[PDB]
Amino acid sequence: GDDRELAILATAENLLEDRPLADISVDDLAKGAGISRPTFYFYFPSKEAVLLTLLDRVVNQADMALQTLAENPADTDRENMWRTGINVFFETFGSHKAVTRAGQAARATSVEVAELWSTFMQKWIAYTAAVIDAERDRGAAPRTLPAHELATALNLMNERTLFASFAGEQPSVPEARVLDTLVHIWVTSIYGE
Amino acid sequence: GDDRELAILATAENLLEDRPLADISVDDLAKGAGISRPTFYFYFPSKEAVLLTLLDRVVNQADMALQTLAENPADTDRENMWRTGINVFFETFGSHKAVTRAGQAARATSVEVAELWSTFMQKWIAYTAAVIDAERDRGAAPRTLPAHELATALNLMNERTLFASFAGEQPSVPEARVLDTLVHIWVTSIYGE
Ligand SMILES: Clc1ccc(Nc2nc(-c3ccccn3)cs2)nc1
Ligand SMILES: Clc1ccc(Nc2nc(-c3ccccn3)cs2)nc1
């Protein structure tokens, strides 16, 4: 039951490490999961639905980790607060690079994947803006740009920069440098001038 | 001769305003250019080659405008220097939104488009880093992050943020706010702390 669905998902994630979604067949997923092709279609309508489910799990994992931080403030300086938050995405998506790469690609071809990513980006931007606003209200950050516009650009920077780093794109920031790089830009732009 | 090639390119750019590359046929391009389909294949091997040529023209237009600025420093403050440079990309790609949108999409499917974008991004990042380094050498900017890593993240931010704005993505910064937003983040991260 749920065991076969999890086996399909585990097989898909393992196969996406080696090749793109277009090079993986339903029979590959069925075979790796130890089921027949018709049995696969009982659990998922398509291989694209499998990827959507994998990406949904990863994005909710990051979202739930961010929620945990939001409820449990670590006792540190403001730079460390932003670093701990950015690290949720660095660690969560960096621990699932194949699903990250395949899910970002599927945004062009799947409206459900595009809508999933858009929904969570809006949530993460709204949370970023709310924290910036709280920093301004307590007098720690200056009232410069509209907080929601600043939050939008910073979150889009992280999306593009983290995923370029994980994919080894040229150009990209080395993965071992990308957290420090992003934290610097967030802290200087939120607290500067 | 060159007149027919330009007619194909003009037709392609006009049609990309209304639909994606996948919804445009060679006969559409031939018909719009006033030539036959076989005559089209004398000038371009495919509709994808037409898009590659259009994107090549746009990216070289931006690159040449940046080169013009690099030779002719405007007499202003440091914030205005970065704003004038970012504006080259805002105006050039924003004046060709359809080719911008279609070219970015083709990066996934065309190695020549991916290599074209990568080559110019590397050039623009190297120039950004060189200007940051010159600002540090003259004592105007602090020695914080490695200049090339900072330049990489800032250029990737601009790519993602400008193109989200032009496409009206959710989420995106409004087009009328995106230049101010990017300039703030560049100036604070280059000169801050
Ligand atoms: Cl891929 C991707 C997509 C969105 C984001 N957004 C982020 N928001 C935060 C954050 C941290 C603390 C408080 C508020 N927000 C850190 S990173 N980051 C990476
Ligand atoms: Cl889409 C895209 C791609 C790359 C960039 N990079 C940029 N470099 C500059 C710049 C300006 C002055 C001096 C050095 N660099 C401004 S914007 N911007 C938008």
From Swiss-Prot, chains A, B:
Null allele phenotype: Cells lacking this gene leads to ETH hypersentivity.
Disulfide bonds: none
Site, as annotated: Inhibitor-binding: N155, N158
Gene3D superfamilies from the UniProt entry: Homeodomain-like, Tetracycline Repressor, domain 2
Activity regulation text: Inhibited by tert-butyl 4-(3-thiophen-2-yl-1,2,4-oxadiazol-5-yl) piperidine-1-carboxylate (RF1) and 1-(thiophen-2-ylacetyl)-4-(3-thiophen-2-yl-1,2,4-oxadiazol-5-yl)piperidine (RF3).
Complex formation: Homodimer.
Function: Involved in the repression of the monooxygenase EthA which is responsible of the formation of the active metabolite of ethionamide (ETH).
Additional facts recorded: Binding of inhibitors to EthR induces a conformational change in this repressor, which is then unable to bind its DNA operator, consequently allowing for increased transcription of EthA and bioactivation of ethionamide (ETH).
Keywords annotated in UniProt: DNA-binding, Repressor, Transcription, Transcription regulation
InterPro entries with a match to the protein in the record: EthR_C, Homeodomain-like_sf, HTH-type_TetR-like_transc_reg, HTH_TetR, Tet_transcr_reg_TetR-rel_C_sf
Family matches, as Pfam families: EthR_C, TetR_N
Annotated HTH tetR-type domain residues: 2-62
One biological process term in Gene Ontology: response to antibiotic
GO cellular component, one term: cytosol
Gene Ontology molecular function: DNA-binding transcription factor activity; transcription cis-regulatory region binding
Residue ranges of DNA binding: 25-44
Annotated protein name in UniProt: HTH-type transcriptional regulator EthR
Keyword Transcription: yes
